[PDB]
Amino acid sequence: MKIGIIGAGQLARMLSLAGTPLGLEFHCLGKNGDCAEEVVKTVTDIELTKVNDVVAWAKQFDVITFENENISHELIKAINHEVSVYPSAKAIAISQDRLLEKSFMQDHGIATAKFVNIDSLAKLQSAVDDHGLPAILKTRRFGYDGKGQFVIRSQEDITKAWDVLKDAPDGLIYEAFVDFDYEVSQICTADLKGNIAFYPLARNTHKQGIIVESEAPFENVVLAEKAQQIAKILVKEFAYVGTLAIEFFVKELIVNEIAPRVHNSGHWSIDGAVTSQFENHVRAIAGLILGDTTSRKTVMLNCIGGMPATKDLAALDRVKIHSYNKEPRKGRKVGHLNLNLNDETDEYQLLQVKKLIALSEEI
Amino acid sequence: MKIGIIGAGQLARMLSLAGTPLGLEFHCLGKNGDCAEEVVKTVTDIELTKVNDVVAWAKQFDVITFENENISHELIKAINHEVSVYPSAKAIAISQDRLLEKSFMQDHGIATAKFVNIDSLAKLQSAVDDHGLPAILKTRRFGYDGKGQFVIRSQEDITKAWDVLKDAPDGLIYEAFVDFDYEVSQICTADLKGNIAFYPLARNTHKQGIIVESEAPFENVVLAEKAQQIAKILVKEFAYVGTLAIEFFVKELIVNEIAPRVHNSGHWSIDGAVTSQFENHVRAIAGLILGDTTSRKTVMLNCIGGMPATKDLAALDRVKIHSYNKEPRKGRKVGHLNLNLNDETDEYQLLQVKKLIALSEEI
Ligand SMILES: Nc1ncnc2c1ncn2[C@@H]1O[C@H](COP(=O)(O)OP(=O)(O)NP(=O)(O)O)[C@@H](O)[C@H]1O
Ligand SMILES: Nc1ncnc2c1ncn2[C@@H]1O[C@H](COP(=O)(O)OP(=O)(O)NP(=O)(O)O)[C@@H](O)[C@H]1O
Ligand code: NA
Ligand code: NA
Ligand code: NA
Ligand code: NA
C-alpha cells in the first residue's frame, strides 16, 4: 500500500518513520530540501494551484493525507473524488477558518471564547462594546503561532488593529481574550469505521504563541470525560478518519481550536504510548485496526529556533532525541525531546535538558 | 554528520530508522531495490571488488559501518585508512572465519565446541576418532542459517561430508555437535571510549538453523555475569566500537559464535528497551554517549519466508509490527513482530500471533 502525503515537513517525516515499519510506502508532495525527503520513497514538487497535476500525482497512491489544514479544501474535494483523502474536506473547511470553527462549536453547545465576525471598524467597535477588552483581532484564514493578529488592550488599539488587518483576504474575527488557568489538549485517532482510540489529556505550555512543553498524562478524570465527548461529536459530524487534535482552555473546558491532524501536543506519544499519534494516523488511513494507546508519564520539550548540540543531549542518556534535521531560524520548530518521568534521575536529567534548551532557543 | 553503511538490507534499514531522529544522515552501498532505500538519503551500487571506488564513495561520509561481517577485511582496512570504520577490521577478520573465531576463544580460556581445522579426509577421520559423533563439517567462511555444512552422524557420512565440502574456498572446520539445554545471546554496545552498555540476556529458539523466537530479559544473574565478562574481553581485544552480539549454548556458558553488528536476537530491544541495539550502534559510531538500556519483558517472533497480512496483525493491537518490505522467498527474513509481555491479554495476543505466523511461515 502506498500513502501520499501533501507536505514534506516534520509531521510528514514522523508519519513515515512511524508507518514504514508497518510495511507502508510513503510519497510526499513538497520540495527536495524538505525534511521528510530522506525518510520517504519519493518527493514531488508540484504547485498546489495546478489542480489536475496534483490529482494526477495523487492517483499513483492508495490513500492521501496532509500535514497542513490550510490547504485548499476544493483541492482536497477534487482529489478525494478520485482517491480517498483522510481526513475529510469538511474537517479541513471548518478547522481552517476561525469563524467556521467557533460557529461549529457554538452550534453544538460547546464553549468557546466569545467571538464576532468583523467586516468593518464599526463592527469591531461594537464587538468591543459588547464583549470587552482585552481581546484579539485575528484573521480567519492566516496565521501560525500567534502571528498575523493584533491584541486589543485599549480603545486606541482598536483603529490600529483594524488598520493593520482590514485587508486580510477572507476576513477577520474578534475573540475575547480568555483568562485561563492552564491549557490542555485531547488527541485521538478515529479508524475507518469511526472507532476512536483516545490518548490521555496533555497539559501544554505556550510561550510567545508557540508550544514549548507538553506533559502527559494530565490526570483529571472529569475534564478527560468532557474532552472525549467533544472529540466524539467532532469525529461523527466530520465523518472523521485519522488523528485529530483539540486544544482547550481550562478555567470548565473551553475549546480554543482544533487541528485535523497529528499535532505538536502529541509528540510525547512517540516515547510515551504503546502506539504513537503518528503510527495511529497511518493505521487509521490505511484501513487498519488502531494500536493500543496505553501511556506512561512523559514530558515533551520543543526546540524552537535552535537545538542543543547532539553530543550534549546524548549525555543525558534517558532523553529521547527528535531532531527534524531542519534549518535553524528564529521561531522555527526544529526538533523536540521526550523524556519518560519515573524517578529522581529523570527529574535531574529534565533540569539539565531544560538548561540546554534555554541556551539554544531562539523565539 | 553523515554515516555510510555497507549494505542496504533490513539491518541497514533499522539503523537508519533508529538513527535518523538523532539528526544523522544515512547513505548505503547496495542496490535500488534493497529494503533500506526508502529510509536512507542515498543508495549507491558499487561492486565491492572495485576497492578504490568503494573508498572514494566512503570518503563522502564521516564514519562507516557495515551490516555483514562476511565482507573483505582488506577492503575495510583500505577504507579505514581514509575514513573511520566501526567496528574494527580485527573483529571482522576473527568473526568471519570459524577457525579464527574458535581459536580466539580457546586462546583466552573461553569455552567452545571442540573444533579441528580440516585440510584432508584423514584429518576429518582423526577429528571424528578424537572428539566423536555427531559432529558438523562446516566451511570456515561460507554459510548462513545452517546452510553450507554437513552433519556427520555415522562413519559413512564422513566421506560424504568431505566429498561435498572439500573444495570450499578458504577451508573447513570440524565441530563437535553440542547437546545444549537452551541458547542465549549477549548483545552490548561499546562507545568510542570503550564504555559498554549491556542488554539483558535473550533466550533464543532456532528452528532448522534460523532464529524464530527471542525472549528478553532472560533472568539468570550468574550466566549474565559470565556473558558480560566475555563481552568485555572481546571489546577490549578488538578495540571494539559499536553493537556486538555473542551467541551461547547453555548446558556452563559455551560460546557458539559472535557477530560484530546488530543481530536478530536483539530486535526485541526496538520495543523493549529505552534505547535499542540500533540506536546505540548509531550513537557508538557517531562518537556520542550511549542511551540507557533499561528493559522490559518482550518477545520477538521472526517472519521467515512469508509474513501474516498486516490487517490480521493490526487486529492484535499490542503487537509491534516490523515488516522489512522485502520479497517473500522460502527461508528469507522478511520481518519480525515484538510484543511486551505484562498481563494475560498479552499472552492471549501472543498465541494469536504465533498461529498467524504458523500459517504464513515458509522455511
Ligand atoms: N482568545 C485567546 N485568548 C487567550 N489565548 C489565546 C487566544 N487565542 C489564542 N491564544 C493562545 O495563542 C496560541 C496560538 O494560537 P494560534 O495563533 O492559532 O497558533 P497555532 O498555529 O494554532 N499554534 P498551536 O495552538 O500551538 O497549535 C494558542 O495556543 C493559545 O495558547
Ligand atoms: N556445533 C553445533 N552444535 C549444535 N548446534 C549448532 C552448532 N553450530 C551451530 N549450531 C546451531 O545452528 C545455528 C546456525 O548457525 P550458523 O550456520 O552459523 O547460522 P548463522 O548465520 O550464524 N545464524 P544465527 O546463529 O541465528 O546468527 C546456530 O545458531 C546454532 O543454534
Ligand atoms: Na527519500
Ligand atoms: Na483550527
Ligand atoms: Na531513499
Ligand atoms: Na561469527
**Nine-digit cell at A287?**
484501513
Q: What's the gap in Å between A102 CA and the centre of ligand 4?
A: 9
Instruction: Supply the residue whose CA is at minimum distance from atom 23 of ligand 1.
Output: A145
Cβ < 6 A, ligand 1 pocket: A 113, 136, 143-146, 175, 177-178, 183, 206, 209, 211, 247, 256-257, 264
For chain B, give the longest Cα–Cα distance.
59
Of the residues B115, B145, B172, which should be mutated to test ligand 2's pocket, given the most ligand atoms within 8 Å of the CB?
B145
Three-state secondary-structure class, residue A307: coil
Nearest to A292 among B37, B275, B318 (CB): B318
**Residue type at B259 in one-letter notation:** A
| Strand-pair partners of B4 | B27, B64
Asked if A298 contacts A340 with a C-beta cutoff of 8 angstroms, the reply is yes
A27 interfacial to chain B (CB closer than 8 Å): no
Pick the CATH number of A97-177 from 1.20.1060.10, 3.40.50.1860, 3.30.1490.20, 3.40.50.1000: 3.30.1490.20
Sort out which chain B residues have CB atoms less than 8 A from A283's CB and list them: 314
| Ligand 1 atom closest to residue A113's alpha carbon, by position in its atom list | 1
Measured CA distances, B140 to B93, B96, B171 (Å): 12, 8, 6
Full strand arrangement of the beta sheet holding B135-139: B115-118, B172-176, B135-139, B149-152
Query: Is A149 annotated for ligand binding?
Result: yes
Resolution (A): 1.8
Closest CA to B9 of B86, B71, B53: B71
Please answer yes or no on whether B325 and A23 come within 8 Å at the CB atom: yes
Inter-CA distances, B7 with B32, B69, B100, Å:
11, 10, 24
Closest CA to B242 of B194, B317, B189, B313: B189
Counting ligands in written order, the one closest to the CA of B95 is 6
**Discontinuities in chain B (C→N > 2.5 Å), after residue:** 251
The partner residues of B338 in beta bridges, in order of sequence, read B300, B320
Contact of A311 with chain B, judged by CB distance below 8 Å, is answered with yes
Cell of B60: 563522502
Instruction: Name the architecture of domain A2-96.
Output: 3-Layer(aba) Sandwich (3.40)
Across the interface, do A314 and B283 touch by the CB < 8 Å criterion?
A: yes
CB B322 within 8 A of CB B338: yes
Is the beta carbon of B5 within 6 A of some atom in ligand 2? Answer: no
Report yes or no: A21 at the B interface, CB cutoff 8 Å. Answer: yes
User: Which residues of chain A come before a gap where C and the next N are over 2.5 Å apart?
Assistant: 251
Domains of chain B, by residue range, sit at: 2-96, 97-177, 178-363
Instruction: Please give the residue of chain A at the shortest CA–CA distance from B336.
Output: A21
Query: With contacts defined as CB-CB under 8 Å, which chain A residues touch B286?
Result: 310
Contacts of B343 by beta carbon, 8 Å cutoff, 6+ apart:
none
Identical fold for domains B2-96 and B97-177, yes or no, is no
User: What sign does the dihedral A126-A127-A133-A136 (CA atoms) show?
Assistant: negative
Out of B37, B289, B310, name the one closest to residue A315 (CB).
Answer: B289
Sequence-distant (≥ 6) Cβ neighbours of residue B199 within 8 angstroms: B186, B187, B188, B216, B266, B269, B273, B277, B293, B295
Pair type for strands A182-190 and A242-250: antiparallel
Radius of gyration of chain A (CA): 20
C-alpha to C-alpha distance for A7 and B119, rounded to whole angstroms: 62
Backbone angles phi, psi at A35, to 5 degrees: -75, -15
The answer, for B335 touching chain A at a CB cutoff of 8 Å, is yes
> Grid coordinates representing B167?
573444495
CATH 3.30.470.20 fits B178-363, yes or no: yes
The closest of B46, B108, B38, B106 to B71, measured between CA atoms, is B46
Tell me the three cell numbers of residue B129.
576418532
